[PDB]
Assembly symmetry: C2
Homo-oligomer: 188 residues x 2
């Protein structure tokens, strides 16, 4: 069986912890992860000024799908960039149409609202992003640290990144792989 | 009063989560953080293949000190590179001589052993790095998630990175700043 594949969409102003922790944990799980730069191949200046070099442009990575999961990091400005992108809209609608997992953390879920993805689901967000996500009442809000309603998997903040990433691993590779990846991490 | 300053030494094979989370949290605390590349100015390939562009070479950053804290990420190969570096030895011995904080996580503390820093302290490490750290009995081992004995601050693994970074913030900027930085993170 072929390894599962993840697309992580990296925009200027993304929360770097919410990019790096899921990428790292998914690679620990033996998932083939592509960090794709929204704007192109060039390095991306994250919210706290960490600069990450993407594996590929989104323009190129989006031709190499499909992916088992599409991951949207948070950060207020990163999520706003994801929300404004027609390319992101197309990728998310294709993923939803093929019944593939979509995972978003912190402010990231607000890009689901912008692109009309997953309406009628239970979702969580960062507390400060709740009102934006809930505009129109298209989702039902949850305060769970990770929330999964079918193929929409959401989480709250930097401090839920491990839980979020391990939930992706469990969904793709099963509970046993998630448990094995978790143990060396020294999680509380 | 001038802002505190942190030097984060980034080597090939570093654990990217243990680099990014402390950098981000320290910047949230208003610390001026320099991510310095051990090998030079070029991008650094971390343990799980995240590629980070340093702010400066170590060669340049080490002339712009002193720093309030010197931070050593983990990752087995990153820590081995830190342990082999004469430049790292000199920086750590200068920091120790000026009674400045030194903070190391996961395998990172083993570079303290290599450079003969902080002998006679209580330290923790990743469980798998204990035997290396304890060779010769020069430290006393702790299983605390974060351990601080004077100016030597150590921690265990990816899942202790927030605790580690917030301990640095508390040491530099006080408990109230650490508490204020912590709340928006959604930590368990």
């Amino acid at each position: 069986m072929a390894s599962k594949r993840a697309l992580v969409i990296l925009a200027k102003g993304a929360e770097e912890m919410e990019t790096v922790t899921p990428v790292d944990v998914m690679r620990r799980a033996g998932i083939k992860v592509t960090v794709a730069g929204l704007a192109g191949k060039d390095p991306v200046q994250c919210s706290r000024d960490v600069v990450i070099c993407p594996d590929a442009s989104l323009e190129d990575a989006k031709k190499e799908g499909p992916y088992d999961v599409v991951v949207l990091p948070g950060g207020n400005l990163g999520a706003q960039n994801l929300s404004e992108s027609a390319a992101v809209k197309e990728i998310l609608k294709e993923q939803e149409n093929r019944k593939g997992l979509i995972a978003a953390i912190c402010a990231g879920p607000t890009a689901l609202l912008a692109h009309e993805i997953g309406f009628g689901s239970k979702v969580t967000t960062h507390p400060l992003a709740k009102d934006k996500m809930m505009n129109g009442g298209h989702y039902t809000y949850s305060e769970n640290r990770v929330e999964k309603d079918g193929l929409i998997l959401t989480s709250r903040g930097p401090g839920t990144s491990f839980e979020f990433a391990l939930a992706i691993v469990e969904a793709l590779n099963g509970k046993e792989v998630a448990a094995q990846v978790k143990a060396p991490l020294v999680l509380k």
